[PDB]
Structure formats: structure tokens, C-alpha cells
């Protein structure tokens, strides 16, 4: 970051700076970057889990322009307004992040079936949604949650929601927030450095889920990039105060 | 800082910068970016063996290719751009002694200093901005405007006054070291020789008077303030 007061050489008289409005309305300050990143963002809104697959993959990365919808492109399972959230706009300014993320997963059920959430560390790939690992047609005898990796279970009859905190299990000092083109086929090891692992949800029977994401307490951002080129048309969908 | 009355050699109140066996003077004032830190602590873990410095070679000033600014150039246009260290090894100043340690060592950490010297006449006017983007590989075509440059560590050059600019560049990379050279035996899975990008952009177009010069030139100079090398190997030609 460069403040730019360096370039301001003028030292002539000016009007008063006044008094801040911070604290006047309430003490609930919402200016802290970490506080903004720690409140949740909806990734997946009522998406299906299918037991024919290994599970629904969630790549461990914060919300950003990487998950932004553009009118015309192919339809994904992602929430369309991820790119327009405050924290996504903030993450578009910082290309480095380190620490844990927290995932709030809600299973749309009240059944006694256990739904397992398995953490995969940084393996070098980057996938999302339902996937058959090594293209098999049977995963009940070889579940991902019973392979050895760290796992937690949801029992909807007790509690359909859970909040799980995924560690920074990677080789790199920082995780890369975004690329210029997310679908470009470049150097394969660099391609996978935008995630720190995966979170895999596996059901017993067919059931829907919703997924939110936020930053952990142990979390930092760095490598300030400044604001990008942007567009808006908010004016057009509202009346003015003069009819 | 303060000018004097005219004498035999004009207003002799110049300043200068001496680094190793290289000196660069300046007629007017200079703008300097903030001295900001690099990642420290990972060096001792990432390399089991000790790292090496070659200050006499690396910490000297070395000029690179000339930049031409014209009246045709619009705001936001790239005058030049540099992927570092790659472009200072195998594109610009290839025969520089600054590049000698990169032949043998495979890894390194690099903090740079880049001086810019402009020479436009007093009847011209214009603004140029130089900025740095850390760990820019596959993110050069976004956050790449004049506005992004004004936000990131930068220097501003007025084309009439000919004020000098010094950009201090720390090592801010997602890995412990950056790879120095590609090789036929080495992997293609990792992009080497690029931990940052430097952009030289038009902030306000060059303008001139009636029957005036339609262009003027800027010359960049580079040096390593802290170049630590690791992983000794057999010497190779650079790219």
C-alpha cells in the first residue's frame, strides 16, 4: 500500500477536519477487514448430495472474483451474487491469504443417517461438486471418510447444521486468492496453489445441503493489489427522491 | 534541496547515489517509495545449507533498455513492463556482472531498487507512473490500470521538471524462494524467474508546444539491495 501523501507537496491552509461519526450511532464498528471476512458468505444454495459419487467437493479458498457469475457463461452450482459480497470485494484487493477458513454446512433433513465431512490437505488439484474419484461405480465399501483423513459427522436428527474449521495444510507460505483466467491451462503445480485442500461431504441416501464460508480467527491477508476495473447499473433499477 | 545563484557551471547543487563501482547524479529533487519489509524466518528452514551474498556484483547500478514516450500515448498505456528477475537476466543487460550468480545458484530471495531518469524539455509536460505488483504470475492482465498503480507501491515522474524516482521492491512471494532458471532436465510444473512485475504507464499524455519535440526518453536503472542465493549447481547459460 502507498497512501500517496508522499506526492502531496502542497502545505497551504485548509478547512477543518471536524469530528468523526464513529461511535455516535452505535459502538458496532464494521470497518475492520478481519471482522468483514469473518461473517459468512453463501456458496451453495440447496445443492444435491448423491451417494453414487465419492462426495460433494468444496475447494478451500475464500470468496472472490474466481466465483463471480457473468451473464452468458455456463451455469454452475455456485451462488450468483458471491462476487458482489463485501468480503469478495475485499479479497479482490489481496492476492495472498494464510490461516484457517470456517465452513457452515446445513443438511436439509431430520433423519438419523450420518453425513460425513472429510478434510483433504493440499494435493495439487482444484475441483468442486459431485465427483467419482478414479471413475469407479461403488464407494460405500471404500468411503473417503474411512480412508484415514480427518473427518467429522453431522446427525440431522440431533443438529442439521455444523461449523468446521479447516487448517492451512499446504507447502506454500501464502495461498493465491485469484488468477486473471480461472479456466486457463498453465503450469499444473502453480494452477493448484489457489487452494489449500478440499472439504468433501458424503451422504448415506440422496439429500440436499447449503454451504456458507468465512475466515477463521487465525487468519491474515496480504499483497495489496488495489482496485480493479469495475462496472455498475444500480441507478437504473430505482426511483430518485424526486419521483 | 535549495537552489543557488548561477556560476560558471550553472546551478551546481546536484545530489548523487554511489553504489559499488557505479554513480548516478540528479539535477533536481527525487521521489522515493517507502522502505517496506520482506518475509524473514523461512530462509533458515527452506535451506538447510547457508545462503550467500555477492554485494560487489549485484548491489551496483545497471541500466536497462531505453523507454520512448510520445504525444500519441494515451492514459493507461504500457510504455514498458518487466517480469523480474527473468527479464534482467535474459532480455535486458544480458552481459551485466549483476547476472553472474544466477548462472550457478538455482534458488534465491531478492530485494531490488529501481531508479528512473527522465529528460523532457521545459516546454513539454506530462505524467508517468511506475508501480510494482508482487507475485504477478497469471494475474498481470487484472488490477493493471493507472488506479491499481496509484494504490500499490509506486513512483510518479513529471516529464517537464525531470524529477528522479526510486522504487524500493521487497521480496513478497507465496514460496520461500523463487527459481532462477528453467532447464531441460528441470520440471515445467513451476514457472521460474518471476516473483514480481514492474509496469511503466502513462498517467497524463505527453504534450508539446508549436514546432516542439513529439517525444522524450526515460532510462531505468536496477540494483539488488539484498540478493541471497541458495542451492549451488553447475553453471548454465541464462535462458
Amino acid at each position: 500500500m502507498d497512501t500517496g501523501a508522499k506526492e502531496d507537496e502542497d502545505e497551504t491552509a485548509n478547512f477543518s477536519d471536524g469530528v468523526t461519526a464513529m461511535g455516535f450511532q452505535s459502538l458496532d464498528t464494521q470497518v475492520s477487514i478481519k471482522d468483514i471476512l469473518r461473517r459468512p458468505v453463501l456458496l451453495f444454495n440447496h445443492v444435491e448430495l448423491d451417494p453414487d459419487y465419492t462426495g460433494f467437493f468444496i475447494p478451500i479458498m475464500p470468496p472472490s472474483r474466481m466465483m463471480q457469475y457473468k451473464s452468458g457463461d455456463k451455469e454452475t452450482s455456485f451462488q450468483r451474487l458471491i462476487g458482489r459480497t463485501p468480503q469478495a470485494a475485499i479479497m479482490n484487493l489481496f492476492r495472498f491469504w494464510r490461516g484457517s477458513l470456517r465452513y457452515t454446512i446445513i443438511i436439509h433433513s431430520t433423519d438419523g443417517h450420518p453425513i460425513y465431512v472429510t478434510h483433504v490437505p493440499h494435493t495439487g488439484n482444484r475441483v468442486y461438486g459431485l465427483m467419482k474419484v478414479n471413475n469407479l461405480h461403488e464407494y460405500t465399501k471404500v468411503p473417503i471418510f474411512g480412508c484415514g483423513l480427518t473427518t467429522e459427522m453431522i446427525i440431522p436428527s440431533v443438529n442439521p447444521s455444523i461449523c468446521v474449521e479447516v487448517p492451512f495444510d499446504t507447502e506454500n507460505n501464502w495461498a493465491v486468492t485469484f488468477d486473471e483466467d480461472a479456466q486457463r491451462n498453465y503450469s499444473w503445480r502453480d494452477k493448484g496453489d489457489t487452494v489449500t485442500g478440499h472439504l468433501v461431504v458424503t451422504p448415506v441416501v440422496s439429500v440436499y445441503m447449503s454451504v456458507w464460508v468465512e475466515a477463521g480467527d487465525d487468519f491474515e491477508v496480504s499483497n495489496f493489489y488495489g482496485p480493479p476495473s469495475v462496472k455498475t447499473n444500480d441507478w437504473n433499477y430505482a426511483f430518485s427522491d424526486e419521483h | 534541496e535549495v537552489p543557488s545563484k548561477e556560476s560558471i557551471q550553472g546551478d551546481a547543487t546536484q545530489q548523487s547515489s554511489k553504489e559499488e563501482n557505479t554513480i548516478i547524479t540528479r539535477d533536481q529533487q527525487q521521489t522515493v517509495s517507502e522502505n517496506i519489509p520482506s518475509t524473514v524466518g523461512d530462509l533458515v528452514i527452506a535451506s538447510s545449507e547457508p545462503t550467500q551474498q555477492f554485494r560487489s556484483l549485484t548491489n551496483r547500478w545497471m541500466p536497462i533498455n531505453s523507454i520512448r514516450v510520445t504525444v500519441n500515448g494515451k492514459r493507461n498505456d504500457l510504455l514498458a513492463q518487466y517480469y523480474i528477475p527473468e527479464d534482467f537476466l535474459s532480455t535486458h543487460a544480458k552481459c551485466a556482472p549483476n547476472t553472474i550468480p544466477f548462472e550457478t545458484y538455482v534458488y534465491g530471495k531478492y530485494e531490488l531498487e529501481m531508479k528512473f531518469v527522465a529528460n523532457g524539455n521545459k516546454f513539454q509536460c506530462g505524467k508517468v507512473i511506475i508501480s510494482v505488483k508482487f507475485d504477478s504470475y497469471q494475474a498481470d492482465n487484472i488490477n493493471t490500470g493507472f488506479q491499481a498503480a496509484l494504490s500499490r507501491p509506486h513512483i510518479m515522474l513529471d516529464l517537464s521538471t525531470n524529477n528522479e524516482g526510486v522504487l524500493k521492491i521487497p521480496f513478497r512471494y507465496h514460496r520461500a524462494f523463487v527459481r532462477n532458471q528453467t532447464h531441460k532436465t528441470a520440471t515445467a510444473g513451476v514457472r521460474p524467474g518471476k516473483f514480481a512485475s514492474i509496469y511503466v504507464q502513462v498517467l497524463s499524455p505527453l504534450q508539446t508546444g508549436e514546432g516542439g519535440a513529439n517525444d522524450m526518453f526515460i532510462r531505468p536503472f536496477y540494483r539488488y539491495t539484498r540478493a541471497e542465493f541458495a542451492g549451488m549447481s553447475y553453471k548454465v547459460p541464462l535462458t
Binding site: 503450469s187 | 498505456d77 514498458a80 517480469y83 504470475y137 498481470d140 514457472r191
Partner: peptide, 26 residues
């Protein structure tokens, strides 16, 4: 095919990104 996969030869370097020589990208 998908045009995002590979960059055209005239604007790019060997590592499938915009060349430093290619100033017109902006």
C-alpha cells in the same frame, strides 16, 4: 474448443501468459 485454455501465439510467451513485449494487451 474452450478459447480460455490456451493464449494465441502472437500475444503470449512459452508459459501460456501475455508476453512482456506485447504492450497492447491493455
Amino acid at each position: 474448443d474452450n478459447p480460455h485454455r490456451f493464449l494465441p501465439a502472437n500475444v503470449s510467451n512459452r508459459w501460456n501468459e501475455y508476453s512482456s513485449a506485447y504492450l497492447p494487451r491493455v
